[PDB]
Design a protein around this ligand. Structure first.
Ligand code: 2PG
Ligand code: 2PG
Ligand code: MG
Ligand code: MG
Lengths: 437, 437
């Protein structure tokens, strides 16, 4: 029985406040920390921020914490909900808030309780968290599947000072045989890349962005990709390490066209690309580099350009801004054959039950699911247990640097050790990890 | 009763392997993780690395992990040790190794067992870790004293491009009335600094170094200190925020003299500073900036230069590489009146008991103690409970960015909340926090 529900303010990996929730039962005190989200936006669940400019640059979460303590807590404890019934927990929270976008109580207030309940449930059942999540999601557990980590190495776009328009460059050690080996070789490529970066671009280019990757002043996608391929080969892992991109092409979508020089104030509007033109740019990259996944190749509402490219892409295409972990938008992407993988952000929908459903609906359609971090992460390792419980075969949780990233990666090491012969590393089968063996 | 001792490799905040230990008792499984420094003092207890070029850039810890699993563990479990008696735990570990510098087993094999035993002890006693640590150290608990956080905000020296030789610039919110307030106001200064740095040095100078501070190409100490003052002012916290330095002067110490242009390959050797001249440099900075602490002002065995400066410094002078958390070296520094505060790094000495002794010897000489992280940190939060247990009034655990730093700062928020009226914030009284009330 849940005897107490409590929230406090703590700090995320960017140094902004976030909500931490503790649920107390007979098994002890169970803690979940919510990562950074969005307090504005057209489709997604909205976190609640205080907007008091004299505290935390306006980014306080006192109101959301108060909603947990004053509103959610007494009604939840009184309801005497079975924490093992995650659907009942979440139905209760969703109905209490009464808004689609969770803006009455705040998506951050809601998710804290949702996730803490699942930890209390695992303890009641005397099972590890990932096992309980497997139960909730009805995933196959003979064997379990460990994910390929899509490790951030380098950033461009809004997160860098060069002309480079594309946002994320990731390495995926699909050629490793275990998760432990995957993380070792990925880390080796990372350090080789960092040293090469400092040598070529200067010491400051070695400083890290929010998610632990470098951000030198790179001019072109080819420059970035040659550097990565060269670091892969220098580390001795050519053939075992593949590449993933996040184009975040909504960031350079202007008046129906795509501006690959959007950071240039005097960008030649005649150089701007149409849908088919940008697709050919990706085709050219795919010919020259071991790219196995591309995220947000076209803008968040440009459905026809996604559907067109998907006809011939022939690699995993990941929806992020297109879908925003939103069920109706996922359904649309599936119908329009716009992509074949969902970037899954638990806090973007705001409950565990709805996150699980979004993954299941993707899997039903033959899609992949890449479990995702946020920019403001925490020491909480929930998404590590979640990626295993959902059997997805792939996770994006940062570079092998900054411990809000390493906490998840280390947790995956532990889970692999624990499961032993009843788990396999997804490796080359990352896309359909859920159907592996 | 300890039934099992186990170790595994995990990753620190820089993506390098380190040792994680788990100790099992009737109360459960207790986990401690060993941190790792860079350019470590010559006198630190040995951090054992594998040196296999073909794995982790030679930085593996397989040998240290093996020392736990194959050597310490079998013996420890058969030794019938009472984990509550930390002195007995550490006496046992030290007798196994039989070397002054823990070079037989590795300090990174010994420390994780030392720490995990204290967590297991706290659990047996049904007390939070900080209370157990207060008991072990014979510290007063009525009230406990919460630390001023010395927040890394800007880095120079080998950590940055540009000419700036001094390594570390910290802010200390001494004028706050609670820990929660100190962290809030410190975070606001940090964000103001990020914005200013990006505005003046470019977007990429907003990227962070290993401990979460910015590391732009800065030319002089005055330029850096002026930037920090501008950030404090813009945040509105003039008068409540003080400054600490860690010069890490051993890094620029060249045969009797100090090279303040050490990143210049053609640095002018006639311009290198003597001990007395460097002391004058510090005195000049002290007159123009609210500096209340300077760490490693002189090199790790340059005793005369420490002693001279200390005669007139008149502010807290902190020994890090000089003392390496070693009671033998502390006694020398006390005798030579070289400094008046210890930077306490548990992994410099290798056991909890020796670390506690080092703190106690320091307090007995009327020194302060600043409990410290390493530049390579993890999701482990031990030092937050330690700084409260030891009643020191000051901790150095990073910028308020990167969760290997926030994990400690968040834990301190939780401790403050738990203690309520049972604790006081050290504030202006940080130096002698142990003697407060
Ligand atoms: O863009 C994203 O996918 C996330 C993580 O990088 O960023 P934010 O959490 O700021 O939306
Ligand atoms: O010099 C120090 O005090 C520490 C932390 O700033 O660095 P390292 O852990 O590398 O010794
Ligand atoms: Mg994206
Ligand atoms: Mg130091």
């Amino acid at each position: 029985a849940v005897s107490k529900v409590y929230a406090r303010s703590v700090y995320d990996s960017r140094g902004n406040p976030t909500v931490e929730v503790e649920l107390t039962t007979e098994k002890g005190v169970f803690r979940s920390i919510v990562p950074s989200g969005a307090n504005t936006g057209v489709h997604e669940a909205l976190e609640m921020r205080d907007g008091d400019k004299s505290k935390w640059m306006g980014k306080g979460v006192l109101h959301a914490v108060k909603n947990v303590n004053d509103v959610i807590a007494p009604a939840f404890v009184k309801a005497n909900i079975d924490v093992k019934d995650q659907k009942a927990v979440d139905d209760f929270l969703i109905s209490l808030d009464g808004t689609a976008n969770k803006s009455k109580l705040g998506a951050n207030a809601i998710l804290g309780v949702s996730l803490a309940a699942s930890r209390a449930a695992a303890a009641e059942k005397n099972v590890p968290l990932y096992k309980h999540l497997a139960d909730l999601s009805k995933s196959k557990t003979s064997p379990y599947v460990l994910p390929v980590p899509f490790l951030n190495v380098l950033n461009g776009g809004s997160h860098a000072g060069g002309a480079l328009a594309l946002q994320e460059f990731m390495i995926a050690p699909t050629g490793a045989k275990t998760f432990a080996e995957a993380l070792r070789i990925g880390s080796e490529v990372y350090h080789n890349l960092k040293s090469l970066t400092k040598k070529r671009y200067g010491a400051s280019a070695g400083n890290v962005g929010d998610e632990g990757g470098v951000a030198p002043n790179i001019q072109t996608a080819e420059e970035a990709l040659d550097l990565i391929v060269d670091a892969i080969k220098a580390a001795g892992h050519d053939g075992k390490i593949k590449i993933g991109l996040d184009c975040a092409s909504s960031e350079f979508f202007k008046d129906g066209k795509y501006d690959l020089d959007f950071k240039n104030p005097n960008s030649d509007k005649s150089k701007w690309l149409t849908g088919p033109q940008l697709a050919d740019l990706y085709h050219s990259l795919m010919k020259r580099y071991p790219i196995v996944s591309i995220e947000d190749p076209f803008a968040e509402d440009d459905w026809e350009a996604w559907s067109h490219f998907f006809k011939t892409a022939g690699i995993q295409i990941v929806a992020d801004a297109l879908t925003v972990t939103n069920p109706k938008r996922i359904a649309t992407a599936i119908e329009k054959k716009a992509a074949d993988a969902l970037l899954l952000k638990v806090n973007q929908i705001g409950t565990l039950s709805e996150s699980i459903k979004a993954a299941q609906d993707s899997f039903a359609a033959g899609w992949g699911v890449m479990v995702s971090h946020r920019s403001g992460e925490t020491e909480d390792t929930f998404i590590a247990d979640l990626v295993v419980g959902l059997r997805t075969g792939q996770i994006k949780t940062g570079a092998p640097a900054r411990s809000e990233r390493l906490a998840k990666l280390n947790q995956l090491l532990r889970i692999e050790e624990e499961l032993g012969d009843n788990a396999v590393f997804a490796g080359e089968n990352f896309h359909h990890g859920d159907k592996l063996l």
